[PDB]
Amino acid sequence: ERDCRVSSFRVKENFDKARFSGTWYAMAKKDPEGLFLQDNIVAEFSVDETGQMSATAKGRVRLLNNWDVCADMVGTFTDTEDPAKFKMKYWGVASFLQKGNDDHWIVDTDYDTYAVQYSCRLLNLDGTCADSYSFVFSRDPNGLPPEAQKIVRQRQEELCLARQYRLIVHNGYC
Ligand SMILES: CCCCCCCCCCCCCCCC(=O)O
Ligand SMILES: [Cl-]
Ligand SMILES: [Cl-]
């Protein structure tokens, strides 16, 4: 009876790009189809004076046949009418790395502790998501405090994803 239509999902009110800048460690991920980033995922967000948000990311990706590389990725965000909803053009510093353009929603954050991100790459015909991914980020690479963890769990459930995350390990691979 809970609403899993993407159009129903709340996102961060009055999202502040500047406050969101800096280092975010991925603690957990819900994978899309054909998953790319595997683990050791760290993102760096910036805003320029134009107010244009961008990011870089490092992580282990596993090219099939069991070949691990540390991907170095770049993203730039185009604003929409909602301050928390963006279009993210992304690519790798190496041209053979995955590129594309995904929706990028900041579902919730308190800026200095946790963030929940969401992307629906493809809708179902009933408005639910056919192919989604989601990152939970922490400022502290050692994880979230309990109050933040509990808030995040609520947000995960609201996205209809709470059963579908896996933990992201950080072990200096990159
Ligand atoms: C959304 C993660 C951080 C945002 C920083 C954008 C920098 C490019 C990251 C590329 C994400 C594309 C792969 C995401 C889906 C996946 O890993 O399976
Ligand atoms: Cl709990
Ligand atoms: Cl669960």
Curated annotation (Swiss-Prot):
<dbReference type="InterPro" id="IPR000566">
    <property type="entry name" value="Lipocln_cytosolic_FA-bd_dom"/>
</dbReference>
<keyword id="KW-0844">Vision</keyword>
<dbReference type="GO" id="GO:0009410">
    <property type="term" value="P:response to xenobiotic stimulus"/>
</dbReference>
<dbReference type="GO" id="GO:0019841">
    <property type="term" value="F:retinol binding"/>
</dbReference>
<dbReference type="GO" id="GO:0048706">
    <property type="term" value="P:embryonic skeletal system development"/>
</dbReference>
<dbReference type="GO" id="GO:0030277">
    <property type="term" value="P:maintenance of gastrointestinal epithelium"/>
</dbReference>
<dbReference type="GO" id="GO:0007507">
    <property type="term" value="P:heart development"/>
</dbReference>
<dbReference type="GO" id="GO:0060065">
    <property type="term" value="P:uterus development"/>
</dbReference>
<dbReference type="GO" id="GO:0044877">
    <property type="term" value="F:protein-containing complex binding"/>
</dbReference>
<dbReference type="GO" id="GO:0042572">
    <property type="term" value="P:retinol metabolic process"/>
</dbReference>
<dbReference type="GO" id="GO:0060059">
    <property type="term" value="P:embryonic retina morphogenesis in camera-type eye"/>
</dbReference>
<dbReference type="InterPro" id="IPR002449">
    <property type="entry name" value="Retinol-bd/Purpurin"/>
</dbReference>
<dbReference type="GO" id="GO:0032991">
    <property type="term" value="C:protein-containing complex"/>
</dbReference>
<dbReference type="InterPro" id="IPR022272">
    <property type="entry name" value="Lipocalin_CS"/>
</dbReference>
<dbReference type="GO" id="GO:0032024">
    <property type="term" value="P:positive regulation of insulin secretion"/>
</dbReference>
<dbReference type="GO" id="GO:0140104">
    <property type="term" value="F:molecular carrier activity"/>
</dbReference>
<dbReference type="GO" id="GO:0045471">
    <property type="term" value="P:response to ethanol"/>
</dbReference>
<dbReference type="GO" id="GO:0071939">
    <property type="term" value="P:vitamin A import into cell"/>
</dbReference>
<dbReference type="GO" id="GO:0030324">
    <property type="term" value="P:lung development"/>
</dbReference>
<dbReference type="GO" id="GO:0014850">
    <property type="term" value="P:response to muscle activity"/>
</dbReference>
<keyword id="KW-0732">Signal</keyword>
<dbReference type="GO" id="GO:0042593">
    <property type="term" value="P:glucose homeostasis"/>
</dbReference>
<dbReference type="GO" id="GO:0050908">
    <property type="term" value="P:detection of light stimulus involved in visual perception"/>
</dbReference>
<keyword id="KW-0488">Methylation</keyword>
<keyword id="KW-0964">Secreted</keyword>
<dbReference type="Pfam" id="PF00061">
    <property type="entry name" value="Lipocalin"/>
</dbReference>
<feature type="disulfide bond">
    <location>
        <begin position="4"/>
        <end position="160"/>
    </location>
</feature>
<dbReference type="GO" id="GO:0060044">
    <property type="term" value="P:negative regulation of cardiac muscle cell proliferation"/>
</dbReference>
<dbReference type="GO" id="GO:0034633">
    <property type="term" value="P:retinol transport"/>
</dbReference>
<comment type="function">
    <text>Retinol-binding protein that mediates retinol transport in blood plasma. Delivers retinol from the liver stores to the peripheral tissues. Transfers the bound all-trans retinol to STRA6, that then facilitates retinol transport across the cell membrane.</text>
</comment>
<comment type="similarity">
    <text>Belongs to the calycin superfamily. Lipocalin family.</text>
</comment>
<dbReference type="GO" id="GO:0032868">
    <property type="term" value="P:response to insulin"/>
</dbReference>
<feature type="binding site">
    <location>
        <position position="98"/>
    </location>
    <ligand>
        <name>substrate</name>
    </ligand>
</feature>
<dbReference type="GO" id="GO:0016918">
    <property type="term" value="F:retinal binding"/>
</dbReference>
<feature type="disulfide bond">
    <location>
        <begin position="70"/>
        <end position="174"/>
    </location>
</feature>
<dbReference type="GO" id="GO:0007603">
    <property type="term" value="P:phototransduction, visible light"/>
</dbReference>
<feature type="modified residue" description="Omega-N-methylarginine">
    <location>
        <position position="121"/>
    </location>
</feature>
<dbReference type="GO" id="GO:0007283">
    <property type="term" value="P:spermatogenesis"/>
</dbReference>
<dbReference type="InterPro" id="IPR012674">
    <property type="entry name" value="Calycin"/>
</dbReference>
<dbReference type="InterPro" id="IPR022271">
    <property type="entry name" value="Lipocalin_ApoD"/>
</dbReference>
<protein>
    <recommendedName>
        <fullName>Retinol-binding protein 4</fullName>
    </recommendedName>
</protein>
<keyword id="KW-0845">Vitamin A</keyword>
